[PDB]
Amino acid sequence: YRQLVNSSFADLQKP
Amino acid sequence: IDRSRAFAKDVKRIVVKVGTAVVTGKGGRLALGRLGAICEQLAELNSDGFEVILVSSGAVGLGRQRLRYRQLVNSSFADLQKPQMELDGKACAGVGQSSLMAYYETMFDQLDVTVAQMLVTDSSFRDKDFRKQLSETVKAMLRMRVIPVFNENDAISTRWDNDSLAALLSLELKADLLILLSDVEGLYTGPPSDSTSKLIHTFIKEKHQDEITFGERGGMTAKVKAAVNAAYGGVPVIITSGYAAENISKVLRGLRVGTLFHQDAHLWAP
Amino acid sequence: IDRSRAFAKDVKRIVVKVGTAVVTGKGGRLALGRLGAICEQLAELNSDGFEVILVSSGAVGLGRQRLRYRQLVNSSFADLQKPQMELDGKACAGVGQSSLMAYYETMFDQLDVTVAQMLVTDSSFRDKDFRKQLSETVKAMLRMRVIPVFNENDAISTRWDNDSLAALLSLELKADLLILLSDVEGLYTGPPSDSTSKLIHTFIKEKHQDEITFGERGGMTAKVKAAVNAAYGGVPVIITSGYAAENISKVLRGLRVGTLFHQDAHLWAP
Amino acid sequence: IDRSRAFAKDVKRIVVKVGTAVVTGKGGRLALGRLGAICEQLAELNSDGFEVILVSSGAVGLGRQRLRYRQLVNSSFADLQKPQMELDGKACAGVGQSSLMAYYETMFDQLDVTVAQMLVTDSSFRDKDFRKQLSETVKAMLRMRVIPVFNENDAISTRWDNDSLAALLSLELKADLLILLSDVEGLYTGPPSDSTSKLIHTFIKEKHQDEITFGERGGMTAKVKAAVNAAYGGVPVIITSGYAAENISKVLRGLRVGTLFHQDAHLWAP
Amino acid sequence: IDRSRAFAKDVKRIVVKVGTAVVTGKGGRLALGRLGAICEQLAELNSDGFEVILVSSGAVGLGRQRLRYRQLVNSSFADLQKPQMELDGKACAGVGQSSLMAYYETMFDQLDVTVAQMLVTDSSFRDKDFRKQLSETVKAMLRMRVIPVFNENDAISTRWDNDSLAALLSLELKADLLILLSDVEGLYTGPPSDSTSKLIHTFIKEKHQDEITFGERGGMTAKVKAAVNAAYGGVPVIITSGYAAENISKVLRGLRVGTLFHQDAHLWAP
Amino acid sequence: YRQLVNSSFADLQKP
Amino acid sequence: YRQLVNSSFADLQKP
Amino acid sequence: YRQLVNSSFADLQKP
């Protein structure tokens, strides 16, 4: 969850 | 047809300006239908032997929409809690100009019309050679059946709205008509909201200048200034709503619509 | 990896220039494949944390193609016997800039990249305020992950090629690398045609300047001048063929390809 | 709000059909403004939580325009004296479908909406498995916030208009509303030209079927047939002019506009 | 020029197939440069008096990319922790076909070429009338200097790859050459990875069929099957890498590149 | 024929 | 924060 | 002139 809360939306797009 | 619009029978070169309230719609996105109908009307005019010149606007807003999207795409959820910084205006215009030009080119290709982009700054107009060369280039482009689309280069400026730029080009190019497409049906003696303000049909500098009570880029005060400038200079000025594209054809058909600015209206005063 | 290209490990902001021999192909039409591969490489670089700046060219040629088509469409058969007059150059650039910008915007949208158009004239660079404000705007756009695409506004000029403009922007913006994409594999001691000319890998101002024998906008003499300017100024310069898009990644990977212009090459002299 | 349109408060899945008299304008070219306003309205509806399905048309006409242009471009002046042969219809549809799909995709990308193209022939509807699988696929696409755009594959047919296809899909997909965008304000008891024909607001199969006197793909007889089919089946049907895009929002707001086909109108008979 | 490719001097109607490994590049996005060079080559061939037919592919992948983007745009952060469901394939193809067709139309308009979209399912080929009518329509389109672009309608199928569809169309249309653009330089006696596999130049059904050891839509086994089918049928088959667009011109120039499938190779056996 | 020899290609496009 | 953690990216785009 | 009267518009486009 920490990683997600510190990701940029674009990052979520890339595996 | 009233003689107040008798000049509509011999108008050959016209200048059309579209404000940001016309090109951009909800949420800062492009008003597809409105802007598309305007382009259809312009292509129809160009086919019938008219040489038109379009001064558009809407670069800043589109730019802002796109840049905000990019910011949100790149942001990190932990950053959507704190408030975001307010975007750079010149970058916004730089993006919006490219987007608007691509969109215009797409639908003018769809209508089988060739268009050219001319971005001019205020500082460039201080040279006589620049004005002469611009007149030559625009004359050549108009002779080649191409619609010039001007604007102010905001991305590179070091700072006079498009309305004033429109008047300038119409006077420098000796155009026969200047049309200002706004979001309102025309000039009003007061705010359009109240019922105590009526629709003008002919502007009289001596009379009509005092009783107008404007509200608190440039709003309508600027528009009026630019129009009066163009008129005095020699080019009639017409203000009409850009929400209905058929307003252009009706204006060119002599139909009495919109607000007019003619120096000869002193004699044509009813 | 030779130490002559050791700077490729810390290059962050780069400037890429594409000549007209790269953007335009047969018949003055757009080189779709070449230009598309270049854009793919640029988008890949932008994703990996680089801030790139593209100075393109090809406006004049595309414009000419389109305007010639329009002339032929409007001509009357009785006019195809007599010879046609030669098109206006500034109108040509005005049309070509819009077409090129729309095309660039289309495929950068396809690659999910936001781009902005900045057209700057020579006369605008005589103000210190202009340079400061341009640096601020470009810094903001690069921080917002947007690729600026510059060029010279030919449509409005009153006349320094893009090569010189590239060098200027790279020195004013303190970029870490300047890449000149040409149609040849790189600088040569003579004409590329003969077999007596070999491929340089490092340019030495003291040595290599005399024996070069160039042929009879700006060709390669101008390119060399601009490169040496940028180098002396502080920004390394790389010249490589734009026909293979993977040349960009190879250059950024430290691979020894193309011609280099570094002031430190005096110490790095082999 | 009259209770005759009380169903407009719970309509969730709707089907919108645009006729060739709406998509195509003068000279067989695309009606940019009209079609753009329709797309803007559809995107606005899609944002507000509606799942819409568009069945369009205009492939044949656009195709014909483009193919005629190509024929004229390739013709030899000595061939413009003799009369040209009349173009193949299926080739015309094949070109027009691609052009229309590209144009739709362009402006739905502009409005930030994803669209999908589904071309279905009459012969494919004779399999139960096909209908089940189509329902599953369309349900998935609607759940994914994507607007399906159907049509008949004319390019490959071996031959039921879009109106009938619309009714079919609306009944197979259990849509809550079927809107038929035509060029007229709605159904009429006679030809719209004369002043002896008045505007219907609710269609009664028992009563209103006899006194209607239609003139001499499918015109309005077909439209009425398809509408009555959809109604009987269970899906209300609304016929309204496609010239004003705000008609869609007004219909979805419960405003009494257009012609309605409800089986419950027997009880709602005034 | 070896006599094994002597047929290249009289080939007039050709069929070109592009696999998904050619049209789609990194991340499921469109391979702009590769696909653009292919289109440039096809337009050049079309200008020189050839009638080409393109069977493309890449709908499913593009569709998937776009739909994934839409899912991520609509998702709620609380949903990015749990694993997302796997997308519907037919919806994916439905979106991808539209996107690919729009992209193809854009750059074929850029190259001044008219294209048409033909989507055909397997179930439609069970009627003799369908084949006759398809041959007539394709003949008319080819005579009108238009490039047909076929594919399988996946969005509506109830399920034979494009390779097999290519062979089918090439045999039904009596084309003079069938080119299969793959990601590899051609057929190999084994996997391309190891150094023990060499490049074939002519395929012999009697000899070469046994020693080939393929690995574990359709891969290369299917490709070979389809090629042998087309050959036996009468239409030579050429397999070559689609990464270099000049391979097409080299093949049409008689240069010995790629893998060939000719029934006459029994006599032309070296 | 005179009309044709004095038409502009665009004109041929319009009836 | 709860609202954000329960918003869809698109929602963040609209004020 | 004969050549012109027997050319296709496209041909005129190419030198």
Ligand SMILES: Nc1ncnc2c1ncn2[C@@H]1O[C@H](COP(=O)(O)OP(=O)(O)O)[C@@H](O)[C@H]1O
């Ligand atoms: N006296 C007036 N008559 C008409 N409109 C006025 C008046 N005073 C203010 N306005 C307002 O000015 C607006 C148009 O100015 P502006 O917004 O600058 O045009 P645009 O931005 O579209 O170029 C109108 O929407 C109108 O409400």
Ligand SMILES: Nc1ncnc2c1ncn2[C@@H]1O[C@H](COP(=O)(O)OP(=O)(O)O)[C@@H](O)[C@H]1O
């Ligand atoms: N000494 C040299 N070494 C390499 N190329 C040279 C030399 N002298 C002249 N050239 C020519 O200059 C050309 C590149 O200059 P230019 O045409 O101005 O680039 P572009 O127009 O693509 O920006 C090359 O095609 C090359 O043949």
Ligand SMILES: Nc1ncnc2c1ncn2[C@@H]1O[C@H](COP(=O)(O)OP(=O)(O)O)[C@@H](O)[C@H]1O
């Ligand atoms: N009784 C009627 N009421 C209304 N319209 C009618 C009637 N009879 C014929 N029409 C004509 O039918 C036309 C609409 O049918 P059609 O052309 O098939 O729609 P589209 O082609 O736009 O799908 C209208 O333009 C209208 O003039």
Ligand SMILES: Nc1ncnc2c1ncn2[C@@H]1O[C@H](COP(=O)(O)OP(=O)(O)O)[C@@H](O)[C@H]1O
């Ligand atoms: N004997 C073989 N010779 C060549 N390629 C082979 C062989 N066996 C398997 N392949 C593989 O098959 C692939 C091409 O098949 P395929 O992926 O179906 O093409 P596409 O998907 O591009 O249409 C090549 O990448 C190649 O590595």
Ligand SMILES: N[C@H](CCC(=O)OP(=O)(O)O)C(=O)O
């Ligand atoms: N740069 C231009 C400025 C135009 C302008 O300020 O005038 P207006 O938007 O009031 O017509 C733009 O915003 O698009």
Ligand SMILES: N[C@H](CCC(=O)OP(=O)(O)O)C(=O)O
């Ligand atoms: N106006 C620009 C000039 C660019 C220029 O002259 O430099 P080059 O075309 O040699 O790279 C154009 O032609 O596109």
Ligand SMILES: N[C@H](CCC(=O)OP(=O)(O)O)C(=O)O
């Ligand atoms: N192939 C479709 C047929 C559609 C059709 O015939 O119905 P209509 O054009 O009357 O709405 C087209 O013409 O675009």
Ligand SMILES: N[C@H](CCC(=O)OP(=O)(O)O)C(=O)O
């Ligand atoms: N629907 C088509 C299927 C094509 C296909 O499976 O063949 P291949 O992708 O192996 O060339 C697509 O995926 O684009």
Ligand SMILES: [Mg+2]
């Ligand atoms: Mg203003």
Ligand SMILES: [Mg+2]
């Ligand atoms: Mg040069």
Ligand SMILES: [Mg+2]
């Ligand atoms: Mg009908």
Ligand SMILES: [Mg+2]
């Ligand atoms: Mg396969």
